[PDB]
From Swiss-Prot:
Function summary: Calcium-permeable, non-selective cation channel with an outward rectification. Seems to be regulated, at least in part, by IGF1, PDGF and neuropeptide head activator. May transduce physical stimuli in mast cells. Activated by temperatures higher than 52 degrees Celsius; is not activated by vanilloids and acidic pH.
Record note on modification: N-glycosylated. Phosphorylated by PKA.
Highest taxon of source: Eukaryota
Compartmental location: Cell membrane; Cytoplasm; Melanosome
Protein name, per record: Transient receptor potential cation channel subfamily V member 2
Residues of the full protein shown: 67 to 189 of 756
Subunit structure: Homotetramer. Interacts with a cAMP-dependent protein kinase type II regulatory subunit (PRKAR2A or PRKAR2B) and ACBD3. Interacts with SLC50A1; the interaction probably occurs intracellularly and depends on TRPV2 N-glycosylation.
Amino acid sequence: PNRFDRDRLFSVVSRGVPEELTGLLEYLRRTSKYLTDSAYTEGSTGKTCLMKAVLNLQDGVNACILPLLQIDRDSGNPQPLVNAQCTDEFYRGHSALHIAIEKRSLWCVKLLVENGANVHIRA
């Protein structure tokens, strides 16, 4: 449960159960790596774990987001995976804010803006 991979982390965030997120801090401070590294994001487009988590919600709820954001801000690159945006030609500049705004939801927007974001960022 120490070494984390993109696939298992994506599966964990997809289910929306945050109990098994204990270990991200240890891996980040042991390997000296952030959550914005290429290892945890798709290497073809730029999608990150935040994207998968916000794309899938149970009746509009996703509890795992709060541990995800808090651990990211506790340990991460100056951008806490909120200014990170898709790089693929199809969706250059496309950020998590647009993804959240698509589903016609507010609470995710509130959490994203509260934790900090660049609303002027354009896709």
